[PDB]
């Protein structure tokens, strides 16, 4: 999309060359923002290949907030099992945070249900947020949450929200990332009877791994094609009750598919 793709000319333009936790080397750049108006079609990456399968069962999952991969695993999504123990546990990580962020006071807080709450009695509310960011949970957790916390927002019948990044792999994990928190917000809009707005993306360490160089350039010498439609065959109960075969994409036309390899 375009405005992906200029995020990765930037990177290569502007980006100082480091190194990730002792590996491969980055060119990265700190602090980034782009929007994607939702109406003006679903963003998913059409610049290479991109399928929604492993999103959509990802997403459910963090909705129903148990962290172990077991459900990932019956539906063959493998993108946790790089971090997930012997027994399929991850500690808790978004989905513990997002429906059960525990409290000193031995309570679990439901963000989620708090969100949905906002919208229908409060919209206009500045605080309409959900954070992963449980720094008191952190060491337990597998992995530091990445989407680290996200707000929502509404205004002439449209629902928007923002999403801080606290770190991104541009070529690998971006084109999920926008295309995870977007359904999100279809979901959401949808709960509420709402129309889809924006959704704003902010990153914090933006960056290109040195190995994705090439793969970058070949990206970047293809022209976008029109963003896909999304479609939502049912109307749940609750944001909890959606099932995979309810999402189907439209009009995706897209280049041929990217390996992205990973050093270890």
């Not at 500045?126 to 960011?133: F, H, Q």
């Not at 990044?165 to 999100?184: E, K, M």
Request: charged share 20%; proline share 5%; glycine share 6%.
């Amino acid at each position: 999309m375009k405005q992906y793709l200029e995020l990765m000319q930037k990177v290569l333009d502007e980006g100082t060359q480091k190194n990730d936790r002792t590996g491969t080397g980055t060119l990265s750049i700190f602090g980034h923002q782009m929007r994607f108006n939702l109406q003006d079609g679903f963003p998913l990456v059409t610049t290479k290949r991109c399928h929604l399968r492993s999103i959509i069962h990802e997403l459910l999952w963090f909705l129903q907030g148990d962290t172990n991969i077991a459900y990932l695993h019956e539906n063959n999504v493998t993108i946790w099992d790089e971090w997930a123990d012997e027994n399929g546990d991850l500690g808790p990580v978004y989905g513990k945070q997002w429906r059960a962020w525990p409290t000193p006071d031995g309570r679990h807080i439901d963000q989620i249900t708090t969100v949905l709450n906002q919208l229908k009695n409060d919209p206009d509310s500045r605080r309409i947020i959900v954070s992963a960011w449980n720094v008191g949970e952190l060491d337990k957790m597998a992995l530091a949450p990445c989407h680290a916390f996200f707000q929502f927002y509404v205004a002439d019948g449209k629902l928007s929200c923002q999403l801080y990044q606290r770190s991104c792999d541009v070529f690998l994990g971006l084109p999920f990332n926008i295309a995870s928190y977007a359904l999100l917000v279809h979901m959401m809009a949808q709960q509420c009877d709402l129309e889809v707005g924006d959704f704003v993306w902010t990153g914090g360490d933006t960056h290109l791994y040195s190995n994705h160089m090439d793969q970058t350039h070949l990206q970047l010498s293809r022209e976008p094609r029109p963003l896909p439609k999304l479609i939502i065959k049912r109307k749940p109960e609750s944001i909890f009750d959606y099932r995979f075969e309810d999402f189907e994409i439209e009009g995706y036309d897209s280049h041929p598919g990217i390996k992205a390899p990973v050093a270890i």
